[PDB]
Design a protein around this nucleic acid. Sequence first.
RNA 1: GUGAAAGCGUGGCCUAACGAUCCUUUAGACCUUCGGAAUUCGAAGCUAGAGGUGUCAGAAAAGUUACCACAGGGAUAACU
RNA 2: CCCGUCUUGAAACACGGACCAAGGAGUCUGACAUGUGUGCGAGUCAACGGGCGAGUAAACCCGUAAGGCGUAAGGAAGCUGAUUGGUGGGAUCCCCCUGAGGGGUGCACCGCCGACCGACCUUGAUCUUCUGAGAAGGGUUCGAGUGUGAGCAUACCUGUCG
RNA 3: GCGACCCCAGGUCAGGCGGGAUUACCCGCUGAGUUUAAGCAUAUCAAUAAGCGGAGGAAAAGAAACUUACAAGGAUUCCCCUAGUAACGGCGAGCGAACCGGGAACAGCCCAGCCUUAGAAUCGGGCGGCUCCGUCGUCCGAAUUGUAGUCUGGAGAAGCGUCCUCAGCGGCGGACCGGGCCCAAGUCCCCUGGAAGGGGGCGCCGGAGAGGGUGAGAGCCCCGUCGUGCCCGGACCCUGUCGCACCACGAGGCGCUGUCUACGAGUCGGGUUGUUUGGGAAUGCAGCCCAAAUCGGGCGGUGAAUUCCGUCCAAGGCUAAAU
Lengths: 204, 147, 51, 100
Amino acid sequence: MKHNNVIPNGHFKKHWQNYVRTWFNQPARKTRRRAARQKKAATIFPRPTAGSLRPIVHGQTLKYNMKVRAGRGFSLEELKAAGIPKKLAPTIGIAVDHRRRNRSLEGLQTNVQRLKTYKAKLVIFPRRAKKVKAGDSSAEELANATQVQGPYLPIVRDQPAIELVKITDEMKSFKAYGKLRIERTNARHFGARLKRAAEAEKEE
Amino acid sequence: TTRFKKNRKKRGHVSAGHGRIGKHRKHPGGRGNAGGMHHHRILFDKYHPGYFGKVGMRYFHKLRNKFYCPTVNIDTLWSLVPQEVKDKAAANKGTAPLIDVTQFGYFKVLGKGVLPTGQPVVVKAKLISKNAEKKIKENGGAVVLTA
Amino acid sequence: GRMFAPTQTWRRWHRKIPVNQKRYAVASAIAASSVPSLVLARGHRIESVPE
Amino acid sequence: KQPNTGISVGLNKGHVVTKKELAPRPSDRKGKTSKRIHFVRSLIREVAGFAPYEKRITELLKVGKDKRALKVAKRKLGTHKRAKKKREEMSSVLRKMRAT
RNA sequence: GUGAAAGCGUGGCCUAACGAUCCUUUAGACCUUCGGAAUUCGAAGCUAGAGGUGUCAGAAAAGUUACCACAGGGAUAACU
RNA sequence: CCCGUCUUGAAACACGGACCAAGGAGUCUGACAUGUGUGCGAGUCAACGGGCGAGUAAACCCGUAAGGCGUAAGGAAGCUGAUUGGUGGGAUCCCCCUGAGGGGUGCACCGCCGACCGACCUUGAUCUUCUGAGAAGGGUUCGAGUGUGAGCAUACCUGUCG
RNA sequence: GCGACCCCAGGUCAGGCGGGAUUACCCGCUGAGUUUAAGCAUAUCAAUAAGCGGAGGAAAAGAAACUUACAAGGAUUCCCCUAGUAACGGCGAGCGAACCGGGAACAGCCCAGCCUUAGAAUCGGGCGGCUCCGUCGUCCGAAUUGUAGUCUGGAGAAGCGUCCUCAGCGGCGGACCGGGCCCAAGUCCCCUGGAAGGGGGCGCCGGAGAGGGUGAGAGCCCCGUCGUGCCCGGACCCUGUCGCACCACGAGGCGCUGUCUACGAGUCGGGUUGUUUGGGAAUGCAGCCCAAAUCGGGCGGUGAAUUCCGUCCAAGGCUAAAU
Ligand SMILES: [K+]
Ligand SMILES: [K+]
Ligand SMILES: [K+]
Ligand SMILES: [K+]
Ligand SMILES: [K+]
Ligand SMILES: [K+]
Ligand SMILES: [K+]
Ligand SMILES: [K+]
Ligand SMILES: [K+]
Ligand SMILES: [K+]
Ligand SMILES: [K+]
Ligand SMILES: [K+]
Ligand SMILES: [K+]
Ligand SMILES: [K+]
Ligand SMILES: [K+]
Ligand SMILES: [Mg+2]
Ligand SMILES: [Mg+2]
Ligand SMILES: [Mg+2]
Ligand SMILES: [Mg+2]
Ligand SMILES: [Mg+2]
Ligand SMILES: [Mg+2]
Ligand SMILES: [Mg+2]
Ligand SMILES: [Mg+2]
Ligand SMILES: [Mg+2]
Ligand SMILES: [Mg+2]
Ligand SMILES: [Mg+2]
Ligand SMILES: [Mg+2]
Ligand SMILES: [Mg+2]
Ligand SMILES: [Mg+2]
Ligand SMILES: [Mg+2]
Ligand SMILES: [Mg+2]
Ligand SMILES: [Mg+2]
Ligand SMILES: [Mg+2]
Ligand SMILES: [Mg+2]
Ligand SMILES: [Mg+2]
Ligand SMILES: [Mg+2]
Ligand SMILES: [Mg+2]
Ligand SMILES: [Mg+2]
Ligand SMILES: [Mg+2]
Ligand SMILES: [Mg+2]
Ligand SMILES: [Mg+2]
Ligand SMILES: [Mg+2]
Ligand SMILES: [Mg+2]
Ligand SMILES: [Mg+2]
Ligand SMILES: [Mg+2]
Ligand SMILES: [Mg+2]
Ligand SMILES: [Mg+2]
Ligand SMILES: [Mg+2]
Ligand SMILES: [Mg+2]
Ligand SMILES: [Mg+2]
Ligand SMILES: [Mg+2]
Ligand SMILES: [Mg+2]
Ligand SMILES: [Mg+2]
Ligand SMILES: [Mg+2]
Ligand SMILES: [Mg+2]
Ligand SMILES: [Mg+2]
Ligand SMILES: [Mg+2]
Ligand SMILES: [Mg+2]
Ligand SMILES: [Mg+2]
Ligand SMILES: [Mg+2]
Ligand SMILES: [Mg+2]
Ligand SMILES: [Mg+2]
Ligand SMILES: [Mg+2]
Ligand SMILES: [Mg+2]
Ligand SMILES: [Mg+2]
Ligand SMILES: [Mg+2]
Ligand SMILES: [Mg+2]
């Protein structure tokens, strides 16, 4: 060890040469996965190649709660609100997640509308050729019965445009920094203040 | 690139540039960070002050998402507005643009630099420094808090 | 015996040049193809090419 | 558990949202058994009786050594939470036994 | 503190009389943290000292080999 | 005087070498660093993967709140978070004058001294939800800070380390 | 003494199952030291080599006693990132995960327990028939110390009515995989040479100028190569179409209903010891000791009591794909 250099911390003291993972098959893996998708698309024809419908869910933690993404499946409460029995949903390309809770009305309503939109543009072939049962389409099995490639109800961000407002004297007098400091102070003294209030009751 | 390696220039020179006296032995000073306190003491103290010892409190299972707080300065706030919206701001002085920094991946607004002259702005952010709020107010703007 | 420093498969064979540089190189090559002096200099026989 | 204030700091901080009660679930009654199960366990208690350490707990409760009874329960069962629950069970058994 | 006062005093008239990291312990700050939210114990931090390394820039360390081995050394003994 | 070698000192009564052919030793990889070449630039990077395609391990295309590094630092932490330069030298240019001249210009760089953010300390008119806000005013203290960004990718030599 | 049952013994009794081999990947156990620390004992090498076992085309894992503290995600596995980070460490040498986020893939389920009692409705074997991976009949057994149905917390049972859904085989074709056969154009003239497949001249094919062979650099001598056409077979899966059949008794779905609403023990947990982990008043595992609960239990990365809150439901089981 010599000169001014960062302190080395190479983790190469084990038998690492026996655990090297090369990627020379990376082009081959791309080929195999594409072949699998192409084969799968023909098997499920005319069902969409994108797979089952997924719900809209928020990102977890404070770092990602401002964005939305695809979840596992629609909750039981969402399915009931949309009037789709849970046992029928997976058979018509709707993912079902019996574990997911609904803590807010906004989240519940967002996915309920998504289900209704999906049902609007859903064509269901009858189980048997001639006789037609409830829920099946008529005269639409040939008009626009094609396999859709790619997403059909994409989950995307809708960034609002900058809005120009009129500054009122009420907003100009608002002390944003003072509000933050007061709110922080009340949070870290909540326990102490509640303690003395309780102790006051005992004395009184 | 082998043909540019200096070992090639040293072919036929016996010692390969490592000297006749000292030679190139295996590990004549120990491996890696050996002897940081004994025979490499000067090196560590001269170039790596603070290397040895313990400071501060431990934090078991520390998650970085809880501490996420990207910051944007006053001088950079105007650059977030689209160019087409900048023209509108200068076309009507009665209203002011609403810059919601959270929509651009920022939580707190710091107060480095100055705002454009004669342009009030309404800044919407989770947090803000006192200097940042003062500069926004003295320019005719206002601050709105969100979460 | 065993060769010195035996060749290994995990040599760094590939290179990733930045996309913008690769686009720069292509544009230069396309532009050079319209210069008859450069096309001749590369060994192509374009003496009877109309333009 | 008030609605969020809409501020990023302070009490009840967070994004403003319309909170709703979670839908009832079958697992909400976890830890509750049927009337038959209570009947079966009550009958078996009569047939099986009480364990030797449970007898020790109730003897201490008869002499009013409540503190020592809990310590014996914690040493046997292991946790304070289980120890004090066990002591209350023995007290209930003794409470309705002295009244008979 | 001392002197009426100027002034002198941050140990011994001057040139020696002494000690890192980690750990422990004490002192100080109506201080910070225990990361679901609190209270009280406990624990963990911040600042300054103490417990010591005398091989004194600071491993935790008894012999023997004439049964002996290896890497070397003419940088070094036993002849000329 | 016999080459090679260690050596203060080799023709040495120091060691290797009878002779010839062929083989025979600073490499590959990870991390970092300086330098240089190239691209773009407050950004930069097509990297997992996807769309494809020389019927195709290449090339080409894709970053929608992805991610890395950079764009802000200080503090153990709770937290707070840059009021936006003065001066002495100085390149180049402009004017007068034709002097080792006098004015204007003053980049880069260096020296010197303020100010600003933060740890620590200090300070408190006027308010407040009693612990916070902050008019004014600070410091022989401390910082890998600020005072109109310089980085990111990539190629290679050299160096440290595994 | 004669019988039933229980436990056990014998049988070359009738019909079945098991051992061993292979090493690349996979699962379980066991388990070093060289080495590094410029010495060395903790550490490191390494939860590795060697050792002993067990599988498959994948294995293992898997439908939360989870992540998290958010506006919340939602079986498992894998890739990028997180990150050489939190943490651990003679806090020395070194060591080092996870969640979020972006992608590959995507699939969910089965039991145990209260619930046939107007009927063990279940299963095996012997024998016989048939349309033979099965099914029907008959006989003898198994089983009430419980077979089959119903139920699995996402629920569910029961009652009520809305009147929504549910019952097969066969023919042909496609798709998929494998194989077989035919099919372009010079061997023209001159020179050299042992030989033309070389040089020069004159032609030709080309969706075929990949490759090889033949007496020297062969597109056109030969096999092939490109692109059609024709023919044969394997899978019984997927899919298109046609023909025939098409009993809703029951069961499910939806809506409501006072009520009912059963969920795994020497296991969880605790003490202690050893080992292991980034896991630090103790991450998992194991031994011994103690030993639970049912408006309860486990987890919420600092031990403890107290008051709340969030979260999931262990101690039983199966399961393709991405690797
Ligand atoms: K590979
Ligand atoms: K050198
Ligand atoms: K010493
Ligand atoms: K020598
Ligand atoms: K010598
Ligand atoms: K010699
Ligand atoms: K360097
Ligand atoms: K970026
Ligand atoms: K993309
Ligand atoms: K501090
Ligand atoms: K039979
Ligand atoms: K040939
Ligand atoms: K149950
Ligand atoms: K342990
Ligand atoms: K609980
Ligand atoms: Mg090794
Ligand atoms: Mg995803
Ligand atoms: Mg030289
Ligand atoms: Mg040498
Ligand atoms: Mg040396
Ligand atoms: Mg070396
Ligand atoms: Mg006095
Ligand atoms: Mg002195
Ligand atoms: Mg004296
Ligand atoms: Mg003195
Ligand atoms: Mg000391
Ligand atoms: Mg301490
Ligand atoms: Mg906690
Ligand atoms: Mg010394
Ligand atoms: Mg010895
Ligand atoms: Mg000598
Ligand atoms: Mg000598
Ligand atoms: Mg010599
Ligand atoms: Mg001599
Ligand atoms: Mg020698
Ligand atoms: Mg010799
Ligand atoms: Mg040679
Ligand atoms: Mg560079
Ligand atoms: Mg980003
Ligand atoms: Mg502060
Ligand atoms: Mg200051
Ligand atoms: Mg037999
Ligand atoms: Mg050693
Ligand atoms: Mg050594
Ligand atoms: Mg040794
Ligand atoms: Mg082995
Ligand atoms: Mg076997
Ligand atoms: Mg096999
Ligand atoms: Mg597979
Ligand atoms: Mg398996
Ligand atoms: Mg479950
Ligand atoms: Mg998951
Ligand atoms: Mg990083
Ligand atoms: Mg390890
Ligand atoms: Mg993982
Ligand atoms: Mg993920
Ligand atoms: Mg039953
Ligand atoms: Mg039912
Ligand atoms: Mg029911
Ligand atoms: Mg010819
Ligand atoms: Mg020849
Ligand atoms: Mg032919
Ligand atoms: Mg063909
Ligand atoms: Mg269970
Ligand atoms: Mg235990
Ligand atoms: Mg072990
Ligand atoms: Mg399994």
